[PDB]
Amino acid sequence: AAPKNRRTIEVNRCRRRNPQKLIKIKNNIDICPECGHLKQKHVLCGYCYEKVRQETTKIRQQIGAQEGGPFRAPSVETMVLYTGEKPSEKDQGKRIVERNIKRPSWFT
Amino acid sequence: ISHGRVYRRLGLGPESRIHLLRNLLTGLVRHERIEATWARADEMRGYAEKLIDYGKLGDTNERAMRMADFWLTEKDLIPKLFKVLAPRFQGQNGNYTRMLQIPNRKEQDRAKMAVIEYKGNYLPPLPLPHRDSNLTLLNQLLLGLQQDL
Amino acid sequence: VARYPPIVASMTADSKAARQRRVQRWQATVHAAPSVDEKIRILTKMQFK
RNA sequence: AACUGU
RNA sequence: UCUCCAGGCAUACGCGUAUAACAACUCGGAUAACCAUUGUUAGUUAAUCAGAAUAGGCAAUAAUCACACUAUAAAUCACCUAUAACUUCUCUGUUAACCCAACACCGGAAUGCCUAAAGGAAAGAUCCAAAAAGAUAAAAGGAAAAGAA
Ligand SMILES: [Zn+2]
């Protein structure tokens, strides 16, 4: 079955310009205090998350080199230490990861 | 028609879902923080919490050893669960896993993204939300009400 | 008294370590070839450039 | 005839 | 690294640079990632692999592990006699995920070895509508198992 006649632009225009078919505005936009960038109320910041995710790779890269092989996951707890920080007695008996950078302000 | 459903349909079948969940659980244990789709992350959150209980049960438990071996493909992790994860969560009675929403992937599919991590980990803290301080005008007004009461 | 599983690569995985484990399984069969001629046959039954 | 949601 | 799949490798034929590196992100891939796209530069190595004198004389009896043994469809130049020449290694083929089907077509495509050590990925996301298709399961009964004519 094919259309019996051409559909008029006016009829077509009304269909596409009906409110149901139009793009709706969003009121859930929020600001990120940490980075000062926009975010949604139910969505986290990304500018700061970029630092966190990349820092994780840098920390993970250090971990990968230290292990040196697959299936080498330690059976003991692990800790990350940055330059200017010295291991404590409580840190004994735990895998220690050394980071050349200083302790990040956000990281505690 | 998803009324009363308590299980998500993932993978190519129920076995694939277990294997896909098994792979996700193994990866999470190794790294302690993994980013995945929100639907899949929610489904696997319950499994991770129960796994910590199995570690708490004890190494000598035959069921735990069988459970740990099946769920963890990489066998180096089996000592870790009983000697790293289980000792860490001994004080905790639950809520071992923290799941939060991440901005959706800009990969042309706009999948809902979430991050699931084990609490008490050595990884850098996630950017968690901070509640409003009591110094705010509304809270201070409520503080005055509290003092009167 | 915990029967910890061996820390080895999974046989069915698609990786270098898994491939080596699969290679060892065949190499065990070669070690299990009694006759010298069978050893030669197994080693030479496939033609390669 | 059996067989099975025919 | 993990999960799972199980025709792979050589030659022929055909194709003719689709090969490889770099740089691009417009066009091409029926979307991206990435390139198979665009531009530039590079490539395939052979005395061993492959392709590119004359005149006379004379021939009964297959193979089949060829012996026995039979059979019927009836199944192999040589070597002698003369003549002629008289010290040689160049040329060409060699790449590729490739061909015939208007297409990056669920089609067609010879031989040898071997059957996973080789070769691979069904999941763009979310929802779990109805209806429809495919698959699995059936209380009691058995046309409302593999047995006979
Ligand atoms: Zn921020």
For chain B, the chains sharing at least 3 beta-carbon pairs closer than 8 angstroms are A, C
DSSP 8-state assignment for residue B76 = T
* Residues B71, B51 contacting (CB under 8 angstroms): yes
**For B64, nearest residue in chain C (alpha carbons):** C2
Residue A107 CB-half CA count within 13 A? 20
Rounded distance between C-alpha atoms, residue A13 and residue B36, angstroms: 41
Cα three-residue angle C14-A69-A76, rounded to 5 degrees: 115
Q: Flag residues 36-75 of B with CB < 7 Å from strand E.
A: 37, 39-40, 73-74
**For B104, nearest residue in chain A (alpha carbons):** A43
- Give the Å distances, CA to CA, from A94 to A44, A61, A79, A98, B30: 32, 18, 7, 13, 16
Beta strand A78-83 with A95-102: parallel, antiparallel or unpaired? parallel
Using only the alpha carbons of chain B, give its radius of gyration: 20
Neighbours of B25 (CB within 10 A): 20
Helix (H) or strand (E) holding A15: helix A9-16
Q: How many Å does it take to go from CA C47 to C1' E66?
A: 33
Which one of B80, B81, B105, B131 makes the best mutation probe of the A interface by having the most chain A beta carbons within 10 Å? B80
**3-state secondary structure string across chain C:** CCCCCCCCCCCCCCCHHHHHHHHHHHHHHHHCCCCHHHHHHHHHCCCCC
Which one of A35, A75, A101 makes the best mutation probe of the B interface by having the most chain B beta carbons within 10 Å? A75
* Residues B114, B37 contacting (CB under 8 angstroms): yes
As given in the structure block, the two tokens for residue C20 are 């080596």
Rounded distance between C-alpha atoms, residue B30 and residue B19, angstroms: 16
What letters, b where the CB count within 10 A reaches 16 and e where it falls short, cover C29-47? eeeeeeeeeeeeeeeeeee
Method: cryo-EM
- The one-letter amino acid code at B78 reads I
- Give the Å distances, CA to CA, from A88 to A66, A79, A92, A96: 20, 11, 7, 11
As given in the structure block, the two tokens for residue C8 are 């080895």
**H helices of chain B, where?**
14-31, 38-57, 62-71, 77-80, 86-88, 137-148
Q: Is C5–B75 a contact, with Cβ atoms under 8 angstroms apart?
A: yes
- The one-letter amino acid code at A55 reads E
Rounded distance between C-alpha atoms, residue B47 and residue B7, angstroms: 12
Rounded distance between C-alpha atoms, residue B141 and residue B144, angstroms: 5
Chain A positions touching C7 (Cβ under 8 A) are 71
